Amino acid sequence: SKHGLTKEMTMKYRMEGCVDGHKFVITGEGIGYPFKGKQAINLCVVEGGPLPFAEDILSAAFNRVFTEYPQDIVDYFKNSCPAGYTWDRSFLFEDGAVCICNADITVSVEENCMYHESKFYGVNFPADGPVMKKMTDNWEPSCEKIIPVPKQGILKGDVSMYLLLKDGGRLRCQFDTVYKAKSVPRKMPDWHFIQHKLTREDRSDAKNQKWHLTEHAIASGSALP
Amino acid sequence: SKHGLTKEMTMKYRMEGCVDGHKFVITGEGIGYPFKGKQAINLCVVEGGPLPFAEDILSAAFNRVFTEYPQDIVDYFKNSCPAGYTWDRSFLFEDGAVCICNADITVSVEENCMYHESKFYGVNFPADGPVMKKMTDNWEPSCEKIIPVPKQGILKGDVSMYLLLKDGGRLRCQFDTVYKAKSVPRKMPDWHFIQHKLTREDRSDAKNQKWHLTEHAIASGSALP
Amino acid sequence: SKHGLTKEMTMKYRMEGCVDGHKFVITGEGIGYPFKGKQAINLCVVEGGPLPFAEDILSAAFNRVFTEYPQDIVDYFKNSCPAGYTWDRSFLFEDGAVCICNADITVSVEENCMYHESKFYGVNFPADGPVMKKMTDNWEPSCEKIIPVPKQGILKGDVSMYLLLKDGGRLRCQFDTVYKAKSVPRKMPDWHFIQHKLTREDRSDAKNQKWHLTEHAIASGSALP
Amino acid sequence: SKHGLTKEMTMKYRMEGCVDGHKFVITGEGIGYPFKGKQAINLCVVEGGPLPFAEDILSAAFNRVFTEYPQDIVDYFKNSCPAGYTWDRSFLFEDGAVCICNADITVSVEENCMYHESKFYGVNFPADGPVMKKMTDNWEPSCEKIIPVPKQGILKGDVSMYLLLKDGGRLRCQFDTVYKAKSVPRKMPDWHFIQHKLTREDRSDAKNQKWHLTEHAIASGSALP
Secondary structure (H helix, E strand, O other), X not given: OEOOEOOOEEEEEEEEEEEOOEEEEEEEEEEEEHHHXXXXXXXXXXXXXXXXXXXXXXXXXXXXXXXXXXXXXXXXXXXXXXXXXXXXXXXXXXXXXXXXXEEEEXXXXXXXXXEEEEEEEEEOOOOOOOOOOOOEEEEOOEEEEEEEEOOOOEEEEEEEEEEEEOOOXXXXXXXXXXXXXXOOOOOOOOOEEEEEEEEEEEOOOOOOOEEEEEEEEEEEOOOOO | XXXXXXXXXXXXXXXXEEEOOEEEEEEEEEEEEHHHOEEEEEEEEEEOOOOOOOHHHHHHHOOOOOOEOOOOOOOOOHHHOOXXXXXXXXXXXXXXXXXXXXXXXXXXXXXXXXXXXXXXXXXXXXXXXXXXXXXXXXXXXXXXXXXXXXXXXXXXXXXXXXXXXXXXXXEEEEEEEEEEEOOOOOOOOOOEEEEEEEEEEEOOOOOOOEEEEEEEEEEEOOOOO | OEOOEOOOEEEEEEEEEEEOOEEEEEEEEXXXXXXXXXXXEEEEEEEXXXXXXXXXXXXXXXXXXXXXXXXXXXXXXXXXXXXXXXXXXXXXXXXXXXXXXXEEEEEEOOOOEEEEEEEEEEEOOOOOXXXXXXXXXXXXXXXXXXXXXXXXXXXXXXXXXXXXXXXXXXXXXXXXXXXXXXXXXXOOOOOEEEXXXXXXXXXXXXXXXXXXXXXXXXXXXOOOO | OEOOEOOOEEEEEEEEEEEOOEEEEEEXXXXXXXXXXXXXXXXXXXXOOOOOOOHHHHHHHOOOOXXXXXXXXXXXXXXXXXXXXXXXXXXXXXXOOEEEEEEEEEEEOOOOEEEEEEEEEEEOXXXXXXXXXXXXXXXXXXXXXXXXXXXXXXXXXXXEEEEEEOOOOEEEEEEEEEEEEOOOOOOOOOOEEEEEEEEEEEOOOOOOOEEEXXXXXXEEOOOOO
């Protein structure tokens, strides 16, 4: 219980959102390894299912506690634990669609469990587009830049994301994030990168829309000396 | 009760939102003239006040039923009444801040009253910026383009907005809106303009954050023959 | 010769540019009415023809001297004559393509003729897109906002443009312009609108790519009192 | 003379451009190591000096031949040699300024020298801004994503850049590039990253504006297995 964290943790999730006027509630459970930056998550749509839009857009909404950090970069995210941190993100798609997501991350040390509460709002996805037609096929791996805001004790993230399409194409989406520990820390990182890789597999049956998500994420500094 | 509307109506409002992590609830009452495109509104912060951000950002969230339309353009908004219409908008500020707002408009014909329920979410306003420092001084009058989407029976709005600043400057914000009647109509307008003019005056006292808002709005076609 | 201008003038044009690596030179002649805001132009491709891209993208590059101004708004553009004015514009298309155009406008009072010299550079139009496939069908009429920059004696223009497509669709393009009289004037306008309407008709034959362009443009203040 | 390249090469440069209406010509000479991804360049302003804008904006305009590539990623850039390749880029600054740059790269095998011819156009830098006030202090190291366009035999680059400011701040700029070998190759890379690090030092004296630029660049695949 280095910051209330252990090598293998469980996670519980609850998301509320509204995309193109369609409301929904999703819940989930997962297992992850904070220090390896690995997590695996099972989501279940609990209101408003089946969703009229691609599962893939919600992927990056479901915890930088799961990142592998080298000893030589401050780990703003694990240091914020157990109380945790919150984040706000805008997604700007190349076709004018816009999302905002908000999440709150917290640890129960007694349960060795992370609680994740999020809100997802999306507007202006064209009904004819790959998201509303569910023609998407996961995000490509990426490199996000993490930038400290020193006067404020918060971080920014900047990653240009690509949602791959079933027809072989790709849809660009700009993520701009604000990461805020619940207690603004005296120790702050220098700017660094975090690389990410997602997998997503639908496991929906007759009763329920359900899928499986994984992330693998590793922080690092510039490769140039 | 042409569409359940009369020449002078009252309006009730309830807004829930969250800007840079700060939650709030606002309620309001107003009086307006649908056919003149004129409205006047009094807002009161009922949770989360005083607000940490400029009142001005919420202005365009508080009803295209209040627009003066010439006989020769279909009035998508009055035609949707009494049931009403919903809209979704993204605000993209020049400094990277992003909002989304959602509203639902409906008429009680028996009460001669419009009900307005909205949600406002904003992220990434810099703490040092004019919005979070409350250094803004109303929006400049504008011309919004309204564009029909014929296969779908909905409209888009496109207006480039300018929030004026107390120091003499201006902050650009791009509004992209989707307007959706609750029943998709057979009669749709051609593209047209709507011009808008807002006024805003804070009337906050010791007990309550409160302000007064007005809009005047007129639709028209191109000025070129 | 109010500013070296008369009610009906001729115009000569020369444009050099490069779009997606393809270089070209266009020359033209026209006739216009400065005080009515009306002009008609004939262009001829003189190097690099036939063009691999839609004629329509060059339309707004070919003179705010041709705008109808009411007496109650300063006419920054006619006041700059005969010496004239220069302008710089960025075009940002919704699909990531980007152009820049630069023009220089000047009067020969002796010839009652406006000289127009411009540069047009475009990058990143997808080869598969409506511009490079020549699938476009004129711009929709628009309303540009003109904004004074008082410390500097220059104007900005902001117009959200829509290039119509032969298949019934539309392509958004954001124009941001800087208008600079060659002598920064003591008399500056307040912000106002200019509305525009273009027509374009190809008149290409066997020897030469050629087309005809017209503009009609009228300035005005807000329609709200 | 693997593709006409050797381990250490000289480079000659000529740039023509225009930023906010100010024209200029720059020439340069350098020495670099193609296989190490290292180059060092000396620039001299030969017309239009001293420049009214920060040297730093021209930095990324002055050759992906200088990138360290692992054996397991196709090197589109060295493979295009000696004939070479061309590229087109848009720069979109957070404050609305816009640039376009075009370059042509070619090898003289007999002289063991790379020739670099470029064009740089910038508009809408505010006179009051850090670029026009020369208040900038180099770009931060970055990670660019290189994306193949398989039907066309060209690459795209996407990098979100940060120009550091003398006052401790930062200015965001989005680079979107198109890389085109003069002969479209049968061998194309998969998407990968290139990381970059620039240094810039002014060496201007009484006669001439002059500076020294270096780049170090290394390609790599995702760090996630």
